[PDB]
Amino acid sequence: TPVTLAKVIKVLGRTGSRGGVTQVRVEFLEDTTRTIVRNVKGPVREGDILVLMESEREARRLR
Amino acid sequence: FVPVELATTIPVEIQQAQQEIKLFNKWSFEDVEVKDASLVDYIQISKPIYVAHTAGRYANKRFRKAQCPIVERLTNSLMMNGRNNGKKLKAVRIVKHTLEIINVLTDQNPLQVVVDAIINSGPREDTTRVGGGGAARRQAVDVSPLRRVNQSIALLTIGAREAAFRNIKTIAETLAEELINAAKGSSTSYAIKKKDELERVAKSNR
Amino acid sequence: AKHAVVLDQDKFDRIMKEAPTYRYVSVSVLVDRFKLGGSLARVALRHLENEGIIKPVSKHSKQAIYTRAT
Amino acid sequence: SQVFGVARIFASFNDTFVHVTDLSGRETIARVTGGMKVKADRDESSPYAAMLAAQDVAAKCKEVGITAVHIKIRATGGTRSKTPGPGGQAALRALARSGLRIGRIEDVTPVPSDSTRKKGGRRGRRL
RNA sequence: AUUGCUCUUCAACGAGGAAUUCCUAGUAAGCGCAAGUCAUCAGCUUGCGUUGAUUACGUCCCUGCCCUUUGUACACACCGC
RNA sequence: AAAAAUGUGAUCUUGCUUGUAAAUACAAUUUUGAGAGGUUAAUAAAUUACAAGUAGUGCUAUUUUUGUAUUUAGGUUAGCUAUUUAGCUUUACGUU
Ligand SMILES: [Mg+2]
Ligand SMILES: [Mg+2]
C-alpha cells in the first residue's frame, strides 16, 4: 500500500454543499514544496498531518 | 524504596507503586510512541494520569478533546447506550479489565497495544454525500487526524458491544480481543472491517 | 439448549488436562471451548485456584481473570 | 518504433464511443462504446462507463499490437449540440492511464457552414 | 381489580421497516427524589440534585424563517384571481 | 474393512447407447366468509433398479477367521451492485 504522508500549511475555507468538509492547502512531509489543495473531512488545524492513498489529485469546491 | 510510616497505615504493594515512577493504575505509562505523524499529538500518551477518570472540561473550545487521555476516551465510548449511559465507574472498571487481559496475553504493554489498535482503526479517506443536482454521488475526502482517531475509538467500542449482545464474552474481554486484532491487523475485527470497507468506497469514488 | 452442561468424570479429566496452558482462563474462555456451562466453569476455575497451577489477576464477580503459574 | 492509431472518441450526449483505427481510417481495431460496458440505458454517456470502454479499447489494441494513438474527438455535430459530451474527457483520461501513448489531439466535430434546419421547431423544445 | 402487599400465571418482545423527534456541557442520556393535583391513587408535571458521555464548534444540501432585487391581471392578498 | 483359503472355459469391474420399477410426502397462515367446476395450458427431472451390444474383461465370485465400529469425514447455488480478490440479499419463474 503506497501511502503519502501530508501536512497542513493553510486552511483554504470550509466547503461542501453541507458543512462537514474543508479545503486545505497541503505541503507533504517527504519531498516538500509541492502544494496541493485537498479536501479534509474532520476538525483541521495548521500543522496537522494527513494520511492518504491518492496524492496528486487536486480537489475543488463541491456543488 | 523508603516506606514512610503514616499513622493511617497503607498497604505495602500500594506504597511500592508510588512516587519513584509516574505509573498508570499499577504498571508504567511510559514508551508507546506512535511513529505515525497525524496520530501523534491527538493520541496523547504524553500526559501521565493515574486513573481513567477526571472532571475534564474538555468539551469547551474545540481541540481540547485531543489532550483528553486515551483511556478516558475509551471509557466514554464504552459508556454508550441508554441502559449503560452515564455509569463512568463501570466503564473504567471494564477498561482496567481489558488492560489486565492485554497484559496477560503475550506480556507487552497494554496501553501500547491499545494505541496500535487505534492507529489501525483510523480510516484514511472517507466519503461525504454531495448534492450535485439531485443524485447521491459521494466524493471521496481525506480524514482529519483527530476525526480519524475518534472514528477508531468508536468502531472498536461498537464491535465490543456487538460481541457482548447475547454472549458470555464479557464486554471488556471482547474489547481486548478487538484491540489485539487491530494490533495484528487481521481484518477479523469489526472496526478493521469497517475501515477496509470505507477505503474500498473511497477507491471506488476517485 | 445447545448442550455443554452435562457433567462427567471424563469431562473433568479433560478439563484438568490441563490448567497449565492458556494465557488467561476466564469463565467466558472456558465456555465455549465447549466446556461445562457457566457455573460449572466458574467452579472449575475455583478448583484450579486451590493449590497453585493457575494464579489470579482480577477477583471481581463474573470478570474473573486467571493465568498459569508460576 | 511507435505503432500508431487514431483514437476517435465520438462523445455525444447520452453515449460515448472509442473507435481506434489505422491512419487511413478503413481498418479498425476496437469500437468500444459506453452503453456496451454498462447495461443501464441511463448510464451510457456517464463517465465511469466511458472509462471502462476506453480501457477495453486499450486492451484490444494491446492484444492486436499498437503503441500510440492520435486523439480525434467528435461531438454529435451539425443539427445537435456541437458540445463534447460528459465522457469524452473521462475516456481520454482512461486512455492516458492505460499507458497507450498519445500524440496530436484534435476535435474534428463537423461544425458546418450554415446547417440544414435544426431540432425543435421555431418555439423550440419545451420541457 | 382505587392503591398497597402475599402466593400463584408466566404472554408478547433477541434492539424494531417507511419515516421522524431531541440534543452542543455539568448539557445529552441514565437515575431517583420533589411538590402540584390529593380522602385514596403516578407511568403525568413543575422543580431538584446524583451519575455523566459520544460528535460539531461548520454550512446553507434539506426544512423553516428573514431580508434584497426582480415579476404580478393578487389587496377577503394563492384556500388569491 | 483386515485375514486365511476353496473354484470359474486364465481373471477381473472404467463407463458408454436402450425400457420399465420407484422416493419430491402431509398441509395450514392465506386465497373474495361455505359447496362445486379445471393440478386449465404446460410437463417429466437424474436419482436409484434389473437385465442388453462387450470397448473392457471369460459372465456369474464361493467356504472360514478379528473386533462395540477402527471406517477414510465435512460442504456446494440464484440474483443484484463501480464497495467487483468487496458490499447486500441469498432454492428464482404467474402469487405463498
Ligand atoms: Mg420465565
Ligand atoms: Mg397526572
Coordinates of C-alpha atoms in Angstrom, one line a residue, chain B residues 93-94 97-98 100-101 104-107 168-173, chain C residues 23-24 26-29 31-32 57-58 60 62-63 65-67:
Chain B
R93 CA -13.6 -1.0 35.5
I94 CA -14.1 -2.6 32.1
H97 CA -10.1 -5.5 33.0
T98 CA -9.3 -5.1 29.3
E100 CA -5.2 -6.7 32.5
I101 CA -6.3 -9.1 29.8
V104 CA -1.8 -11.4 30.4
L105 CA -1.7 -12.0 26.7
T106 CA 1.9 -12.2 25.3
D107 CA 3.2 -9.9 28.1
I168 CA -20.5 -14.9 27.7
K169 CA -17.7 -12.8 26.3
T170 CA -17.7 -10.0 28.9
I171 CA -17.7 -6.7 27.1
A172 CA -14.2 -6.0 28.4
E173 CA -12.9 -9.2 27.0
Chain C
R23 CA -2.6 -17.1 28.7
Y24 CA -5.8 -16.5 30.8
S26 CA -12.0 -16.7 32.0
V27 CA -15.4 -18.4 32.6
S28 CA -16.1 -17.0 29.2
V29 CA -12.9 -18.5 27.8
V31 CA -17.3 -21.6 27.7
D32 CA -17.4 -22.1 24.9
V57 CA -5.2 -11.3 38.1
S58 CA -8.6 -9.9 38.8
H60 CA -14.5 -9.5 40.5
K62 CA -18.0 -12.5 36.6
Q63 CA -14.9 -10.6 35.4
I65 CA -9.2 -13.3 35.1
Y66 CA -6.7 -16.0 36.0
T67 CA -3.4 -17.0 34.4

